[PDB]
């Protein structure tokens, strides 16, 4: 998160650390949508171009976390992935269209002051919410600057940008499964997600039932916090169908 703020305790309960066992390092962000299912970015798991191909073994899941580095002794719970599911038409070769994956924990996670899941959106949530200007919130343990590292989980509220802007900001081919976020330079307000932010969620709180929903999944972008540049997020709503498909197929 670039030009963000430290999380508050219990502020983001769904947040997950994608943790690589060996070496021992965070690989990404992610989210608990249930006590047995975690939602990340397909690229946190597979990326041929970069010789990335995490198998369930290579991974552990850390929930309850606030502090990046330390083992959060009686606060966090560490899970083992049971199964991994990559979006069948995830496009690593091009624009990371359908950047979405699911990980089903080897055993049920227990809810708490620090561990509790986010809602996934309905068609009408998304409608009223994902409108340019509307603010959402990103979290991570990722880079604090394009080119430090946080001690504590980081937060940043960013305005959803009108599609056209997204498009005229890049050379990459944006899809309907994508939305971009940030301030315009006019706007003189800063904040980006950054490296190691992938997989985290873009959540907004519904003002109707004042529930927290994951609108997005931190995907890609160019640099971190670069003027006339935006962060791109997978469109959860857009993939929700893919989502009940696997959960009601082999799920919790």
């Amino acid at each position: 998160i670039v030009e963000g703020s430290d999380a508050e305790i219990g502020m983001s309960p769904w947040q997950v650390m994608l943790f690589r066992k060996s070496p021992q390092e965070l690989l990404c962000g992610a989210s608990l949508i249930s006590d047995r299912w975690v939602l990340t970015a397909a690229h946190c798991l597979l990326y041929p171009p970069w010789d990335k191909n995490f198998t369930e073994n290579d991974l552990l899941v850390r929930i309850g976390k606030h502090s990046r580095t330390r083992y959060e002794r009686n606060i966090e719970k560490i899970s083992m992935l049971e199964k991994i599911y990559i979006h069948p038409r995830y496009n690593w070769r091009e624009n990371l269209d359908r950047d979405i994956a699911l990980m089903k924990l080897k055993k049920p996670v227990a809810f708490s002051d620090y561990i509790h899941p986010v809602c996934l959106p309905d068609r009408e949530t998304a409608a009223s919410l994902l409108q340019a200007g509307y603010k959402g919130r990103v979290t991570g343990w990722g880079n604090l600057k394009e080119t430090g590292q946080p001690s504590v989980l980081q937060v940043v509220n960013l305005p959803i940008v009108e599609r056209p802007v997204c498009k005229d900001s890049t050379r990459i081919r944006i899809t309907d499964n994508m939305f971009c976020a940030g301030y315009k330079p006019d706007e003189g307000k800063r904040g980006d997600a950054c490296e190691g932010d992938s997989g985290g969620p873009f959540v907004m709180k519904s003002p109707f039932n004042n529930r927290w929903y994951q609108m997005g999944i931190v995907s890609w972008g160019e640099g971190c916090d670069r003027d006339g540049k935006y962060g791109f997020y997978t469109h959860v709503f857009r993939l929700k169908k893919w989502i009940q498909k696997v959960i009601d197929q082999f799920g919790e």
């Binding site: 066992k21 060996s22 021992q24 390092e25 965070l26 552990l60 580095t69 330390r70 083992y71």
Partner: peptide, 10 residues
Amino acid sequence: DFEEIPGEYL
């Protein structure tokens, strides 16, 4: 840079 985790996890 990461502090050590309970081996029960590995």
